[PDB]
Design a protein around this ligand. Structure first.
Ligand SMILES: Nc1ncnc2c1ncn2[C@@H]1O[C@H](COP(=O)(O)OP(=O)(O)O)[C@@H](O)[C@H]1O
Ligand SMILES: Nc1ncnc2c1ncn2[C@@H]1O[C@H](COP(=O)(O)OP(=O)(O)O)[C@@H](O)[C@H]1O
Ligand SMILES: Nc1ncnc2c1ncn2[C@@H]1O[C@H](COP(=O)(O)OP(=O)(O)O)[C@@H](O)[C@H]1O
Ligand SMILES: [Mg+2]
Ligand SMILES: [Mg+2]
Ligand SMILES: [Mg+2]
Lengths: 74, 375, 57, 375, 375
């Protein structure tokens, strides 16, 4: 049963980062700068993702390399 | 490694996991169903921090790791061990991801609904699998046998299933499961060896004596007569050499160990022996097909690798049933892998490629509806 | 006392199920009776019209 | 296979369908009137998807298929079974289409109008047949007997017809049908065997005991005396060997099973026995011809294959009628097929080739008018 | 203890023996029909050497004694158990010898001749009884009901009898027995609970779940609708507390257990449900009295103690039969003991005191002649 909760926590971990946004107390000009901060968040996110991707690639090579070692000292 | 988009046949039988690609005639990755867990805590530095051993990695070290059985009588006890054994089979032996090919798993007859829903959920949500399918072992074994009639006797490690199939027709009402198999035989041999004088109370020795049984223990053709002639032993008792070197001497106990199957009273249970339960099952069937069930009985399971089971079955059934008809018992060679073999020949059909269950329909329907669709 | 309480709980569960089934049967029987009464009075109205035309003869 | 444009004689008698080409002396395709429906639903792959078995294909498998009788007492219950048995006889045994030759069918006396209109409509609209003809069984049986006088007693499986014909003259007013035949005898034997101790409640066993009756059951020459002498049995009781092997022991029950025909009170019906009903029918005829009906009585139907019916009829009629005249009873050999044989010799005449009913006149007239034309 | 020379009414119904003196309104000695045999052999000294337990003495200890059913489907399996249960009832509860008063026993409809001859012989030769009498249960139940018309449905433990009696008239030809009752329902509940997850394979647990069913299991008013609304359960599922303390949770299974009676296909038998078999029996009766059989149907047997049977019967019969007439179903309170009650009121009549069978006439005639005299 804990594994089902683990999948639920995976969705819950995605859920935690999102929070309610309020557009009623803001005026016309402020909303624009606030939109920009949302945009920078987007930017930031992709950057880390990109990093991970590149690391993933690197890590895969590692795996390959590692496999060869067990195929040379067996 | 694999250039054909075909389902991976992974028979997760109790006691031995047999995994391999479809189309092959034998499983390539064969390892016992055991999970070794680090017992103590070491101050050492450099060893693998891995907190959960599995398969041959656990078999190689049974003195340090406390051994836990991932399956008991049929009901799945721990699901972490399930995730461990599949993740291991996927990313340590087969060297292939489940995101590229289907997976035809084989489950035991008359299993809990919780077990099925749990494995299906781990195979859909956690792991990204394009399609799953649960199959009963008896049908695939009858396929590998190359027939459509007979009663399959599948004796695994902790459960024994008798499944009658006549003229290609399953009988879900007559399938009766009984938790008498290799573990209760290992326990009986252990207690009688403790009675002999060599006493042990740890699981590693239990697995060792299990292997000793698999290698030496056989079925008797006449229990009482062998008891009498073994009272004065000469060639009836054998001296086995333990892999460690200790000289063990085992005599009659061998052919009295599987006898517990024929006399469950030894373990104080009112259940009937495997032969008598099969006979009762035959009465529960219709008379018209009973002769065909007598002439086409098939066996399955690793426990059937002992020498002398066919003859014992023939004498017992002849003593129970009339001796006017013909009652031939057929045991195909390498019956243990036959089930898995069936899986292979079942995954190559295009129609079977049309009977899979994709992720999306399962997600909307939910696991319970999936249970209705299969049966 | 636990045994007595469980016995009472079963007894009332039975009586309550009996209550619900008897009320449903009463409703159904009333429906049938008054539908039949309506059919009787409808054929009565048919006889009324028939006699009126027969007098009109 | 057939080079002569002649009608296919298909006797659809209750219990046994007998089909064959005209001119032959015996039906080539003889199979019981039964329909086997798949009871369960199988997850198996590869077996025939056919949803409706028939004939020997159903007889070979009676444990899996729930058996339904396509005819009951005479009234046709299900028409799908009718279409199944004709389509099977046409495109599985005879290997000939009905679009090239006529078809002389034989129906039972005093049958419903719905039955006749239905079969005629299935034989004209659905299947393209150049011409149809309905014939009563009694006339064809008297033809095969080679006479023109006598009272035909046709005892099928679920109905028994007494039809008097003197000098070739039918008597539609005296034909009286009574639903006492082989099925009610099978039921009586079954309930009395359940009284003996061997209890069964499935149709396959019912057919098995029906076959056992056909093979062993006979008629008694003196009921009460046989009861007394069988009280202390020796050679009066016989031990039969079931085709499955179970040793059945049947004694007096044999010659008490058909006795229910002579004493309908056993099944709690006010109807009179077959012999008494025939005797009453003879009184309903005129006195002048009664002696001829006594001297030319003929029998038909598979139920008449039991040994000892002729003698029982002679003693019963002698006890009922005076013993001054001569009352000889004649039973032609192979009387069961005689009806069908008649059909063959009836389809070779050119005049009969002129008495067929073509499609066009039936279509304009409609089925009801066709009923008027025949009679 | 007894000062009146009156027959002892001992209803030996399948599942529960109910014994008591004539004139009483309820049986005093009520105990299940079970025999407990010592399974093992003890080296202990001092315990009772008694080798055959019975009744409450066996119910109190079900873990040590292997339980055997003295009656199966109706046919008596073991006669030693018969002698045990009567000897026990005579010399352990009633505290009276059978040599001073008669004994009115009640047997099931359509039972084997061997059973009747055996019990009569044990009651005459072995035990010295002045007079015996075998009686059908349906007549006594109709007596206790206080009517002369209706169809009695007696559902015991292993057999179910439908017996129509109109205007005080038995119909031995229409009585049809079917071996569907409480044992097959216990087996169905057991296999579906094994499907739920709690698996057991011993008889003591089987009796425990039988008691759980008797206490909780009820009949559904609409099967499919209850299935749909129970898919999302709240008050539909109940948590039962085992007498041992283990917390069992049972939801829909309850009202799906007796449903097997209405759908025998669940146990893979071609037999029809109890309601459909009763309906067919009504067609087998005459039309004139069919309405009276609809208006006077009576029920008997312990299995009828479930709540919701009357309504289910009414809806099913209304769906099968026309809805123009009136079809009232009457179930007398405490119907289970009513049969026995009848026995009491049947043993007080002087005429019934004149219809007993004394020893001497039986001895000269023999048992078979006694069978003829009764019927
Ligand atoms: N080679 C062998 N010889 C004897 N016994 C064996 C052998 N292999 C397995 N077994 C026994 O069979 C049991 C496991 O069977 P299992 O692998 O579940 O069969 P299957 O895979 O056909 O279901 C264990 O109890 C084990 O003792
Ligand atoms: N060889 C046989 N011996 C005894 N009885 C038979 C035999 N063949 C058929 N019957 C009985 O005859 C009945 C069927 O007769 P049927 O085939 O309708 O006769 P017909 O074809 O002459 O009308 C069945 O009840 C069956 O029991
Ligand atoms: N109080 C009860 N509640 C529910 N079921 C019962 C009860 N008593 C008996 N039964 C059921 O009835 C069956 C036995 O009936 P039986 O005693 O033979 O009835 P009778 O004595 O009227 O023939 C058993 O299968 C049992 O499960
Ligand atoms: Mg196995
Ligand atoms: Mg006939
Ligand atoms: Mg009862």
């Amino acid at each position: 049963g804990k594994r089902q909760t683990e999948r639920e926590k995976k969705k819950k971990i995605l859920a935690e980062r999102r929070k309610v946004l309020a557009i009623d107390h803001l005026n016309e000009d402020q909303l624009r700068e606030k939109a920009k901060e949302l945009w920078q968040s987007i930017y930031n996110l992709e950057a880390e993702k990109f990093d991970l991707q590149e690391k993933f690639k690197q890590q895969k090579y590692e795996i390959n390399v590692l496999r060869n070692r067990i195929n040379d000292n067996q | 490694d694999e250039d054909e988009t075909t389902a991976l046949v992974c028979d997760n039988g109790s006691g031995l996991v047999k995994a391999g690609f479809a189309g092959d005639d034998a499983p390539r990755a064969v390892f016992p169903s055991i999970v070794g867990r680090p017992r103590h805590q070491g101050v050492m530095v450099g060893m693998g921090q891995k907190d959960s051993y599995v398969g041959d990695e656990a078999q190689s070290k049974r003195g340090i790791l406390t051994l836990k059985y991932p399956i008991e009588h049929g009901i799945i006890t721990n699901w972490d061990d399930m995730e461990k054994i599949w993740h291991h089979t996927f990313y340590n032996e087969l060297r292939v991801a489940p995101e590229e090919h289907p997976t035809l798993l084989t489950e035991a007859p008359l299993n809990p609904k919780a077990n099925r829903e749990k494995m299906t959920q781990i195979m859909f949500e956690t792991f990204n699998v394009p399609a799953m399918y649960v199959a009963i072992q008896a049908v695939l074994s009858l396929y590998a046998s190359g027939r459509t009639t007979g009663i399959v006797l599948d004796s695994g490690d902790g459960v024994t299933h008798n499944v009658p199939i006549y003229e290609g027709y399953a009988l879900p009402h007559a399938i009766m499961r009984l938790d008498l198999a290799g573990r209760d035989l290992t326990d009986y041999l252990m207690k009688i060896l403790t009675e002999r004088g060599y006493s042990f109370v740890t699981t590693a020795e239990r697995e060792i004596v299990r292997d000793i049984k698999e290698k030496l223990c056989y079925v008797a053709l006449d229990f009482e007569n062998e008891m009498a002639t073994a009272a004065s032993s000469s060639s009836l008792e054998k001296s086995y050499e333990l892999p460690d070197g200790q000289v063990i001497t085992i005599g009659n106990e061998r052919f009295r160990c599987p006898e517990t199957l024929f006399q469950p009273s030894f373990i104080g249970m009112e259940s009937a022996g495997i032969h008598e339960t099969t006979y009762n099952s035959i009465m529960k069937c219709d008379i018209d097909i009973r002769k065909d069930l007598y002439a086409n009985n098939v066996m399955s399971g690793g426990t059937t690798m002992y020498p002398g089971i066919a003859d014992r079955m023939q004498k017992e059934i002849t003593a129970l049933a009339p001796s006017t008809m013909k009652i031939k018992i057929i045991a195909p060679p390498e019956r243990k892998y036959s089930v898995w073999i069936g899986g292979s020949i079942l995954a190559s059909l295009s129609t079977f490629q049309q009977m899979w269950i994709t992720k999306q329909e399962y997600d909307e329907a939910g696991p319970s509806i999936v249970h209705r669709k299969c049966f | 006392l636990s045994d007595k309480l469980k016995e009472a709980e079963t007894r009332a569960e039975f009586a309550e199920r009996s209550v619900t089934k008897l009320e449903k049967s009463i409703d159904d029987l009333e429906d049938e009776l008054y539908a039949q009464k309506l059919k009787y009075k409808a054929i009565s109205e048919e006889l009324d019209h028939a006699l009126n035309d027969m007098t009109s003869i």
